[PDB]
């Protein structure tokens, strides 16, 4: 979260120069997730 | 406490009789419960304020005990506590919610400027210097003694002086000498 | 260093504007609660009056009848310029001493603005919220210049002699000799004081120089000053932030209720808001009354402290300061 | 009470006599005059999907979500004969009067004889296996009849589910609020005279349902609608709520009412420095209040709450003279006469550089009003100076010793 | 502080579980909000004391 | 708790209270000294000869 990873902005507003506690849908801190790799065909 | 009973708190009336004669059972229960909650909260606030006032009054009563013991049963030596200036005598009378004090003090009205000295010594080899006791060494040379609270020159004797060590700020008397300094 | 608080911030609330925020329907509903708003206003007015009389009594009791000039060259080898008005003045106050400048500058106080606060607020925050919420901070009884006058006149106050116990005589004795007699009265002989004049003056000057740079986080009386300022700000913050309480309504603002509901539902939600805000105002009035009596008692204690430590030497160990008390100086502080 | 401030003071105290003092009174409230209205050209909300085809059943309800469009609510309501409506945290008049961020409509064919099964606390088959209303948003449930058969095509019959379970009725699957039933695939096969239960062998699921018949009567429908506020930059507005656009360039600095892309309120607008995001069009503080606006003219306007000037009355009872103190405001904003003091702009005082020792009407900052035997005078509190004594340069000192005295009683 | 939790404040019960198991959604919101407001006012009074 | 007669009796008995003499710092002795002489000794102790 220190780089604001996976943060969804509020839909119809904005905030300027404050710190706000917002309840919504966020990814958990330290979650590795799942990594997917797309390769290239045989050549 | 008396005027909080007229608060409707959101109900149609602040009296139970109008609610009972204006609505049905469920609405009566709702309005009466509204009044009950409002009055209970007001009573809680009243209890809190009475507790605060009672503890404050107890502390002030202890302060009044201290004031009686200091000013009425004695003469306070620290200025400004009992009254203004030099406290003389105090009288305490009953008051509707406490005690009322009459601090009689010493109030000077006319002041004159007098030349004063810290102390006096002669030129004897073991020089004995004297200092005033609750007063000043005034003049206008010939030195007299006066009280601190009233100007009245008086002869310098052993009844108003105390022997002190020699200081460089003390006046060195050579021509005339008080009986404390004479031998 | 000791801080005694003598006053709190004087706040008056417009009950109608606070409760209804200038809405005609809310005012029509609040007309049933006019007496409670009137009682709130009257209680706040009485508390502010009592505060003004307490401040007047404080500054009447610490007045001096005689004063000597204590400029450099007359105080001897004692540097007392930290307690005096600077010869070059930049404080905006022509009577404020340097130590009062250091006290006031290092405290975080939001400037309310008694002259153009409304204009400054509308030109470009619990101070700009006075004209929004519906309250107002009342200015103190005396301007800071008069308080600085009263506190600076106590530094060079002429009192009776050390051996003459009383307050009926005005002995014009220099500060060096007064310090000499004060040190003699605690159990130091005249020979020691005569042989150690320069060392005593140096130690006094060192004590005052260390007194200069001592308003930092470690200092506890400065923390008391900031705590009084924070208590005033917290009262204002509670008063301003209680207006966002919905109290169970669909919104904490009258406009949304008016534009989202029909007549009966508007009446019910606005009545909930009115009851909540009236209860909040009653709690605020009770808190202000309690703080007012506490400040009055503490101001009386400040009167006693001035009369004991500043205008005389205390023989009671531990009351004024630790150990043997020599001399005390009082300076104006925020709220005390 | 409305004549002047001293009469308002008398009315507030509810007596014809009040003691002398400085009393706070009601502030000079500035009611909003003028309108700033900014709205987009928008488009018509597409309701033709509801009318183009047969309505579905209650277990297979269709949903329409509308955003950033205008709709003719009167034309839509004129096509239905509403039998009843129940609304939560909103009213139909407010729906026709105001704007909202989104509008969601859940419509299905529903018989009016089963109207009690769609209500709040119902525990019948409709609320258990077909449709449960969601109350997380302001909602209105509308049950109406369709008078003209050319508006919406008539379905064959009314159909619903009575129970939906896996193996035994003790393992029934209940529907969620605003969601579809687990037995939707089984209930898609329909219920008629011959078919009244449907079973799946793979998952084991079973669904039982009932039916009505529609024969030469009007169609009865159910509409469950819901709205949201403050969740979008654009708004859904009925066409009766759309007004003419005005401009803010002439209403700056005063309390005005605004309607900015459906967001309504009152406030004070100033040409402020652009902050926040342009695309979101709205800047909010930590208390969910509008503090800024990115307008379509390229300027950013900062929105401020409407403020009231504090007013105080300086009343003297004996001389029956009153003066007005406007706390902490210059005399130009208010526009003897007005003058600027340390405590604001006063009206009704005369300045004569008078100095008084004690006075009973303190205005603050060592200023006070003194009655003159006739208008009150602006005076200053006197600071008496102590008697200055200069020590002499010798081994002697001067002392002031009393020669006369009195006895003072404290 | 402990006994202010048994105040119904006008609700059908002073416990949330009975309100949850006795009423529908909207009435649950109303009664729970009533309890919330009562308990918040009680906590404010406790803090002042 | 007390009727006003008892309170006034308590406050009245303090006016004529006899105490230790001015030169005897204490409250163990009761010196029957007239009011004029007590005032004389009280004025003597503040700096009047
Ligand atoms: C999602 O897709 C599945 C298919 O994988 C759908 O299930 C299928 O639904 C049809 C129509 O209801 C079933 O056909 C019927 O079969 C019965 C015999 O069991 C026959 O008597 C009827 O006349 C009709 O032909 C089909 O069997 C069924 N298949 C499976 C594997 O369940 C399902 O309905 C779809 N979901 C939705 C919501 O449409
Ligand atoms: C963003 O907010 C911070 C915090 O309030 C602002 O920093 C303040 O700036 C003022 C100068 O006007 C200082 O007096 C304060 O001491 C600062 N506060 C803190 C906590 O540092 C900052 O100015 C704001 N930025 C903008 C662009 O408005
Ligand atoms: C909204 O719909 C109503 C119909 O209910 C429209 O009113 C009709 O408008 C037409 C054309 O202007 C007239 O010929 C009719 O006489 C009107 N009344 C009826 C009952 O049909 C109304 O114009 C629509 N509003 C908008 C903005 O399009
Ligand atoms: C729910 O109702 C819709 C109609 O509102 C059904 O959609 C139709 O489905 C049939 C075959 O599945 C198509 O031939 C039609 O063209 C569809 N019409 C529309 C308007 O979509 C849908 O099948 C129903 N769902 C269930 C599970 O019964
Ligand atoms: C009407 C059936 C017979 C009533 C007497 C029998 C039992 C009483 C016990 C429980 C009743 C609970 C259901 C209430 C019905 C509400 C209507 C609906 O849910 O739509
Ligand atoms: C007294 O102290 C001030 C700083 O507080 C200093 O500027 C001044 O020179 C000092 N005076 C003497 C005589 O030391
Ligand atoms: C509607 O009902 C009328 C009644 O006679 C009938 O004539 C008409 O055909 C019907 N329309 C449709 C689309 O079924
Ligand atoms: C809006 O403007 C049009 C002309 O552009 C005018 O006919 C109409 O009456 C106006 N409406 C209002 C409400 O002012
Ligand atoms: C508003 O301010 C912007 C710059 O911030 C400026 O370009 C514009 O001309 C101003 N408009 C008005 C009407 O003052
Ligand atoms: C009052 O008049 C005097 C003399 O003209 C002037 O110095 C002073 O500033 C005036 N005060 C006010 C508040 O106008
Ligand atoms: C105000 O005080 C000064 C002393 O500082 C005095 O000379 C003057 O007479 C006083 N004025 C009044 C009106 O009392
Ligand atoms: C002291 O003052 C009073 C009152 O003015 C006067 O009657 C009396 O004569 C004065 N006494 C002296 C000694 O000046």
Author numbering:
A (entry chain B): 50 to 92
B (entry chain A): 1028 to 1167, 1176 to 1218
C (entry chain B): 784 to 907, 914 to 1125
D (entry chain A): 344 to 678, 700 to 737, 747 to 783
E (entry chain C): 1028 to 1076
F (entry chain A): 930 to 978
What does the paper say about this structure?
Merbecoviruses from bats, pangolins, and hedgehogs pose significant zoonotic threats, with a limited understanding of receptor binding by their spike (S) proteins. Spike (S) protein is the major viral surface glycoprotein of MERS-CoV and forms homotrimers. For the MERS-CoV S-trimer, NTD is known to mediate cell adsorption by binding sialic acid, while RBD is known to bind the human dipeptidyl peptidase 4 (hDPP4) as the entry receptor. The S2 subunit mediates membrane fusion and exhibits a higher level of sequence conservation among CoVs.
In addition, S-trimer structures of six merbecoviruses from different animal species were determined. Different from previous MERS-CoV and MERSr-CoV PDF-2180 (31) S-trimer structures, densities that can be modeled as linoleic acids (LA) were identified in RBDs of most of the currently reported S-trimer structures, with CN-HedgehogCoV-locked-2 S-trimer being the only exception. Consequently, the identified fatty acid–bound 3-RBD “down” conformations for the merbecovirus S-trimers are also designated as locked conformations. Overall, based on structural and sequence analyses, the sialic acid–binding pockets in GD-BatCoV, HKU25-BatCoV, and Japan-BatCoV show considerable conservation compared to MERS-CoV. Among our determined MERS-CoV S-protein structures, receptors for Japan-BatCoV, CN-HedgehogCoV, and EU-HedgehogCoV remain unidentified. The comparison of their RBD structures with MERS-CoV-RBD shows that the four conserved hydrophobic residues are either substituted with nonhydrophobic amino acids or displaced in position. To date, Japan-BatCoV (HKU5-HKU25 clade), CN-HedgehogCoV, and EU-HedgehogCoV (SA-BatCoV-HedgehogCoV clade) have not been shown to bind ACE2.
